[PDB]
Enzyme design. Sequence first.
Site, PDB file in Angstrom:
ATOM      1  N   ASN A 192       0.853  -1.218  -0.235  1.00 38.43           N
ATOM      2  CA  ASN A 192      -0.057  -0.038  -0.105  1.00 38.43           C
ATOM      3  C   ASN A 192       0.794   1.326  -0.118  1.00 38.43           C
ATOM      4  O   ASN A 192       0.184   2.406   0.292  1.00 38.43           O
ATOM      5  CB  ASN A 192      -0.894  -0.121   0.998  1.00 38.43           C
ATOM      6  CG  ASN A 192      -1.612  -1.474   1.312  1.00 38.43           C
ATOM      7  OD1 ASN A 192      -1.430  -1.991   2.536  1.00 38.43           O
ATOM      8  ND2 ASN A 192      -2.333  -1.926   0.412  1.00 38.43           N
ATOM      9  N   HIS A 203       2.957   2.432   2.130  1.00 32.53           N
ATOM     10  CA  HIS A 203       3.475   2.896   3.362  1.00 32.53           C
ATOM     11  C   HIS A 203       4.717   2.223   4.117  1.00 32.53           C
ATOM     12  O   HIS A 203       4.857   1.106   3.745  1.00 32.53           O
ATOM     13  CB  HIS A 203       2.181   2.540   4.341  1.00 32.53           C
ATOM     14  CG  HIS A 203       0.824   3.549   3.877  1.00 32.53           C
ATOM     15  ND1 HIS A 203       0.876   4.708   4.069  1.00 32.53           N
ATOM     16  CD2 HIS A 203      -0.326   3.082   3.461  1.00 32.53           C
ATOM     17  CE1 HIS A 203      -0.406   5.031   3.754  1.00 32.53           C
ATOM     18  NE2 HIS A 203      -1.028   3.835   3.332  1.00 32.53           N
ATOM     19  N   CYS A 214       5.764   7.961   9.019  1.00 32.67           N
ATOM     20  CA  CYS A 214       6.676   8.680   8.399  1.00 32.67           C
ATOM     21  C   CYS A 214       6.253   8.391   6.733  1.00 32.67           C
ATOM     22  O   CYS A 214       5.967   7.278   6.576  1.00 32.67           O
ATOM     23  CB  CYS A 214       8.089   8.069   8.846  1.00 32.67           C
ATOM     24  SG  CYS A 214       9.401   8.343   7.462  1.00 32.67           S
TER      25      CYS A 214
END
EC number: 3.1.2.14
Lengths: 265, 263
Positions: free
Chosen positions: B185, B187, B222
């Site tokens: 995804n 991330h 982050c």
Amino acid sequence: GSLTEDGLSYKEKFVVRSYEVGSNKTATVETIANLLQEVGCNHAQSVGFSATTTTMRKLHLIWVTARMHIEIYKYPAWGDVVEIETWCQSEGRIGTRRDWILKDSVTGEVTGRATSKWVMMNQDTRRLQKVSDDVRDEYLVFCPQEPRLAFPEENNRSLKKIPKLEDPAQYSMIGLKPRRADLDMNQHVNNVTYIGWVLESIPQEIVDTHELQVITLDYRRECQQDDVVDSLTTTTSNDSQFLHLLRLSGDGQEINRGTTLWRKK
Amino acid sequence: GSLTEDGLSYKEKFVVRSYEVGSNKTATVETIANLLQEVGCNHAQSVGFATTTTMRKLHLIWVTARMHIEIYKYPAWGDVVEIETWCQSEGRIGTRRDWILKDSVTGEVTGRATSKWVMMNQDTRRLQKVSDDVRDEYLVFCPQEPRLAFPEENNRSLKKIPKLEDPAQYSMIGLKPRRADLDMNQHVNNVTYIGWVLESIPQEIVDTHELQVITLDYRRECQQDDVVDSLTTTTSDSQFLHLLRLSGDGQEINRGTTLWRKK
Ligand SMILES: CCNC(=O)Nc1cc(C)on1
Ligand SMILES: CCNC(=O)Nc1cc(C)on1
């Protein structure tokens, strides 16, 4: 996880892990690279290595990568079983060669293949030396006597001189540093991290529209634990080609140079 | 790779890979963390998930808020390690996921982990309290009696973590994630934050001590194009306070603690 019937090659099956896949839900190039390293380490261990022989350990000599060539046709999905077959071969006195064949366990089709050139080096002085006859004998009894090449091609992409990227680089990724996860049991930067660092300078748009088909990479110098790398890329080219250069951020000392080929999704 | 006889927990065996080991020839803390994530993902998949029917409809996802891992023995390269995971409910606070690490040969418990998960809307990033409709479809896969990997009431996994005050004793700045650190995804993987936390531990401590415990709070994510600073201070066996913050504004993304033992 076993040597084949003749004991002249090793086979191992892998189930692709959830954290090993990228944005497209398929295994990343670094996961494949790690899987090749794993099957290669186990092949060396299954025949009595540690990949140094008895004579290599006596003369403070080790095998280091000089070139890597990986070609992928289909990246395995999360949950997919992929089977890799590896084998070692002698290249006279230049060094050794290690080849790989990636296959789908269900269909049996070849979804990828790799080849690497290894040069002998003194652990301490870091000086490359030619392979002696005494060492060559110790690893020839584990290699096929007839030449077996994963890239048999009469004029292949794995044996071509790679030029040096000229400044200014079209794309770049600055301040790349390895962490403890990137270091191996001997505290050296893992060969796979250099592949990942090379592709960091490929723009996110190329990654979102193309798939990495080929990657040739020369290993000119090692990056220390406390070193900082700069990754440089320039489009050279339905297919995209790039020239790559990894160098130390400060002095600009070359550590790697390679090429990549990408195809539309 | 199978649910246990009652279907209220998942078990999986792993052979430790050559590239998964560190200088001591034993599995790194990030390899263990990855192995916990793998067994957890497969458990969610084996029961039909880790979002559910109503979670997808409401644009809702599970996010980590806290991680607690304790290791007694790190597995060597070639060793078979078996992990058992299970999910549980925590009223409307969120969900809990526990792990038990074992040696396949001796059957001994060589480690254990526990994590707290909060309900978040993927778009607005707002924490939502867990509703009754989603707790009903999640309770049928959880043990009805409380089963805790860290049963000790008020132990190391449920303690408030203070904020590291400047100046930090040790630091590691300019940390950036690469494509290998991103998940399907796009991330940043939860395990990368653990590795970033320990980057500010000096190489001398790593060469003489072994990481026994690690508690880590996940305050903010982050981004792919973000840069993290890792900060550490000895508080003490050795104990450290940790802080991950964004390089520019100093925005806090994580805060944790580690406990180390002499070798
Ligand atoms: C005998 C050990 N073989 C290797 O280390 N092979 C590889 C493959 C890749 C990639 O990096 N190392
Ligand atoms: C259902 C998915 N579970 C997880 O993602 N578990 C973990 C464990 C660690 C560590 O990070 N994620």
